[PDB]
Amino acid sequence: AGLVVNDNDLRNDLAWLSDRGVIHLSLSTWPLSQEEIARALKKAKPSYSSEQVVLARINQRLSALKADFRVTGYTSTDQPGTPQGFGQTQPADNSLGLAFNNSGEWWDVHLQGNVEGGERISNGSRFNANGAYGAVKFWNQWLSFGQVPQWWGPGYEGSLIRGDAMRPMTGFLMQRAEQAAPETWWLRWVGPWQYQISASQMNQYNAVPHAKIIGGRFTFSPIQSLELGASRIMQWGGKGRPESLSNFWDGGNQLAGFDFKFKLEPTLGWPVSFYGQMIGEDESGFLPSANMFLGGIEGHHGWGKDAVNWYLEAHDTRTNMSRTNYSYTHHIYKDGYYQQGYPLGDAMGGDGQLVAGKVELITEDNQRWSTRLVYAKVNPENQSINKAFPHADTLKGIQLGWSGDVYQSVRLNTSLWYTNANNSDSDDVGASAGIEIPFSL
Ligand SMILES: CCCCCCCCCCCC
Ligand SMILES: CCCCCCCCCCCC
Ligand SMILES: CCCCCCCCCCCC
Ligand SMILES: CCCCCCCCCCCC
Ligand SMILES: CCCCCCCCCCCC
Ligand SMILES: CCCCCCCCCCCC
Ligand SMILES: CCCCCCCCCCCC
Ligand SMILES: CCCCCCCC
Ligand SMILES: CCCCCCCC
Ligand SMILES: CCCCCCCC
Ligand SMILES: CCCCCCCC
Ligand SMILES: CCCCCCCC
Ligand SMILES: CCCCCC
Ligand SMILES: CCCCCC
Ligand SMILES: CCCCCC
Ligand SMILES: CCCCCC
Ligand SMILES: CCCCCC
């Protein structure tokens, strides 16, 4: 029960089911309420065997994720050269995680400890409690405290406003549990809708210590084919900053924009969707300005009993696809829209252009083969505020992956990549490998 933070295997399986019309479920605001996954599963309409295979995997995964005790591990030769997608940015070359889990009807507790080797992202200590939260449920709302990662929007490679490519921040978070449409007769048109609010404290944020990220996101689906999102973030507070309830208003540094996802299955019967996101650095009342852009197209197919996932996605984190040295920059918050050098927005940082494609096959067996190509111009102004991509570079890379159960429930995750670069700080070739061991108590 409770929150379900960024998992990549889960998301792709849910997205497959959703875009094929077998379930109806928003996947553009993480973490997801499990109670909302459960509801969509109870009104699931499969018609192929491939679809029953994927379906059965959903609860199996949530059992894995929320097992009483869970040991996780990651090791690698080096940092990947290209930026990584949803659920795929590791903060160190070598990691080891121990988590105690417990949840019920009205509670979710995830006590997570991590120890690290060969830091990529800076920290106070090689020990940390990232991902660690406790949550309680009341009146269909989940209230959470901890270091919970989020994902805001329909993109697979990044969120332009609140992503994953950075250490999760300590704070409060609130959400609907079940996300049904409003009962009120004159609001029933809105459809399934969801809010997320969060107040967080930035870590080691030099230029203005203890800076807060306060934010809000709203989504709704008026028709099964269209989801619409809105989200806003303000960088606020800190040492030498106004921190009054008064100064805290909306009328700091702001980011704000919209996203959408349009499913084609309900009309053309194609298990294909397209999506977009537009976040701006300034706000013209109702619309944003100084805009970063993101768009993509995704498909989801059955083979025999196997499943195939693919997406093609383009990002532009310049200002209006031309102007540089303003995206993820600020004049008060001078370290920019980054924690410990790593972007709170898109994995690239600001002023970046990115096209990426990914295909993956998933066996009945639940082996998962993947292939990923990417082209990326990054940090053209060699901005120090971005430690993810310190230098102006053009990246042309390929990344292969394999996921599979090795022994009973012990799962192994490998990766292998090559990156053509002009001035990277990481080996042109490398390989990583992760492990998951769930235990009962
Ligand atoms: C003390 C240094 C951190 C511990 C690193 C352990 C990494 C092993 C992961 C194995 C996965 C195959
Ligand atoms: C000492 C740390 C080195 C860890 C490198 C392990 C990478 C193995 C993955 C192989 C996949 C093809
Ligand atoms: C068996 C009941 C255990 C409930 C523990 C939950 C306490 C953590 C809540 C923190 C949310 C702000
Ligand atoms: C039923 C279809 C099975 C064929 C799958 C072969 C293609 C996977 C290639 C993986 C390369 C990383
Ligand atoms: C079972 C489908 C054929 C397997 C193709 C092997 C290629 C090795 C890719 C390894 C990626 C980590
Ligand atoms: C029946 C389950 C056994 C599967 C074992 C697969 C081992 C893959 C290891 C490859 C590491 C590079
Ligand atoms: C300095 C560049 C050397 C990179 C060595 C790591 C690559 C290991 C991947 C292949 C495993 C068989
Ligand atoms: C057996 C239940 C343990 C719950 C721990 C909660 C910590 C606040
Ligand atoms: C079902 C009653 C619980 C209300 C708790 C309110 C938390 C601020
Ligand atoms: C059964 C209702 C539990 C409410 C918990 C609220 C704690 C803040
Ligand atoms: C169960 C509460 C976890 C809080 C961890 C945050 C400390 C930085
Ligand atoms: C059932 C009425 C809910 C009120 C919230 C309306 C969502 C925009
Ligand atoms: C550099 C070490 C490579 C290990 C591959 C199994
Ligand atoms: C009853 C709806 C609550 C929304 C909290 C912002
Ligand atoms: C309460 C959600 C706020 C989102 C506004 C864009
Ligand atoms: C028969 C399918 C071939 C797939 C090549 C990647
Ligand atoms: C991504 C592999 C091709 C790189 C050479 C331009």
Side-chain angles (χ1 to χ4, degrees):
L3 303 187
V4 193
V5 294
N6 304 15
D7 184 60
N8 184 52
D9 280 356
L10 188 65
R11 170 162 185 210
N12 297 121
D13 278 16
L14 288 184
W16 190 94
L17 291 155
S18 162
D19 287 19
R20 293 181 66 79
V22 179
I23 55 187
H24 304 298
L25 183 65
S26 187
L27 300 175
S28 73
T29 290
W30 296 70
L32 308 167
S33 310
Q34 209 194 305
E35 293 72 16
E36 170 62 17
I37 309 178
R39 177 185 131 290
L41 279 186
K42 286 165 191 190
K43 310 232 161 156
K45 292 186 181 188
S47 52
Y48 298 96
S49 336
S50 58
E51 295 172 332
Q52 316 217 236
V53 169
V54 176
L55 271 188
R57 235 137 59 187
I58 302 314
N59 278 332
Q60 187 187 2
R61 189 59 184 164
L62 299 162
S63 284
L65 288 169
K66 296 197 164 277
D68 286 343
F69 176 56
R70 201 160 109 92
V71 174
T72 63
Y74 176 83
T75 180
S76 59
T77 60
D78 204 351
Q79 192 172 11
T82 70
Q84 303 299 283
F86 175 92
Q88 289 152 80
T89 298
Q90 288 275 353
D93 291 330
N94 306 306
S95 217
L96 187 52
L98 302 188
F100 168 76
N101 280 315
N102 198 263
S103 58
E105 164 60 31
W106 59 273
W107 78 94
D108 191 5
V109 168
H110 182 79
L111 295 187
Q112 177 72 62
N114 310 296
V115 70
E116 278 162 14
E119 286 184 331
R120 302 171 175 179
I121 307 195
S122 284
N123 220 29
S125 170
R126 68 207 186 93
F127 286 99
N128 79 88
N130 292 175
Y133 67 87
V136 291
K137 192 170 79 195
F138 53 88
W139 306 315
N140 202 45
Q141 316 318 308
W142 274 113
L143 182 52
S144 182
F145 182 81
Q147 289 182 338
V148 177
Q150 292 152 297
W151 188 272
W152 283 11
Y156 284 101
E157 219 80 40
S159 163
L160 300 174
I161 187 152
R162 278 293 299 102
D164 214 25
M166 36 131 269
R167 302 183 107 103
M169 307 178 281
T170 285
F172 293 90
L173 190 156
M174 223 183 126
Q175 278 184 180
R176 298 186 82 192
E178 275 185 52
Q179 288 152 61
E183 299 161 62
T184 307
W185 70 271
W186 59 273
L187 283 180
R188 279 169 192 181
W189 57 274
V190 169
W193 72 270
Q194 168 66 305
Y195 78 92
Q196 196 186 90
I197 64 188
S198 61
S200 297
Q201 190 174 257
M202 293 189 85
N203 189 28
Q204 290 186 342
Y205 186 77
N206 182 76
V208 192
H210 322 307
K212 319 307 183 182
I213 300 290
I214 297 148
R217 167 171 182 80
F218 183 89
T219 49
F220 73 114
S221 205
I223 47 176
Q224 287 170 324
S225 285
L226 179 75
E227 171 153 280
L228 294 181
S231 39
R232 188 171 150 81
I233 268 289
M234 53 167 147
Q235 203 168 190
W236 176 88
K239 290 195 189 183
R241 299 293 308 153
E243 296 202 283
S244 68
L245 293 172
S246 182
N247 177 276
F248 183 75
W249 53 225
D250 317 310
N253 175 210
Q254 279 69 243
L255 279 88
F258 310 110
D259 29 288
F260 81 88
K261 184 181 170 162
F262 188 82
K263 294 161 222 62
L264 281 176
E265 188 278 336
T267 288
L268 315 183
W270 293 347
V272 173
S273 309
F274 65 97
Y275 53 83
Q277 180 174 57
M278 185 194 196
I279 301 292
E281 277 282 8
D282 312 320
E283 188 146 40
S284 171
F286 44 96
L287 284 153
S289 327
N291 288 295
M292 297 173 285
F293 293 88
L294 170 154
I297 184 183
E298 49 174 307
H300 304 274
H301 308 285
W303 202 318
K305 292 185 151 188
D306 296 345
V308 173
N309 279 286
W310 69 266
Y311 68 68
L312 190 51
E313 193 169 319
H315 294 196
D316 189 304
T317 61
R318 298 176 287 175
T319 282
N320 303 324
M321 317 196 261
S322 56
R323 169 180 165 192
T324 83
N325 228 24
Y326 191 71
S327 283
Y328 301 155
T329 279
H330 201 246
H331 60 295
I332 295 313
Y333 298 92
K334 291 183 179 202
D335 281 4
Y337 192 61
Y338 300 78
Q339 185 179 252
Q340 300 169 303
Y342 276 65
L344 268 64
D346 198 0
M348 264 177 326
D351 310 327
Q353 309 178 57
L354 178 138
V355 185
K358 191 183 183 152
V359 184
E360 57 146 5
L361 182 77
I362 310 180
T363 313
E364 175 168 22
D365 198 7
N366 195 28
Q367 288 182 58
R368 323 193 163 200
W369 307 88
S370 22
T371 297
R372 180 160 164 272
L373 294 167
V374 37
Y375 168 100
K377 293 188 85 289
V378 298
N379 199 356
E381 298 302 321
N382 294 261
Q383 307 175 320
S384 61
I385 71 171
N386 180 1
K387 288 169 52 269
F389 293 89
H391 314 312
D393 210 341
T394 295
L395 311 179
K396 285 152 188 171
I398 182 169
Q399 185 163 14
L400 305 189
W402 175 85
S403 188
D405 290 333
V406 173
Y407 182 88
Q408 290 181 104
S409 205
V410 186
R411 194 173 188 76
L412 189 61
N413 269 50
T414 46
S415 206
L416 182 78
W417 62 85
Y418 172 74
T419 312
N420 204 306
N422 302 134
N423 186 11
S424 177
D425 291 327
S426 54
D427 303 325
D428 54 12
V429 197
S432 60
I435 197 166
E436 298 180 333
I437 307 85
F439 290 111
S440 306
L441 287 165

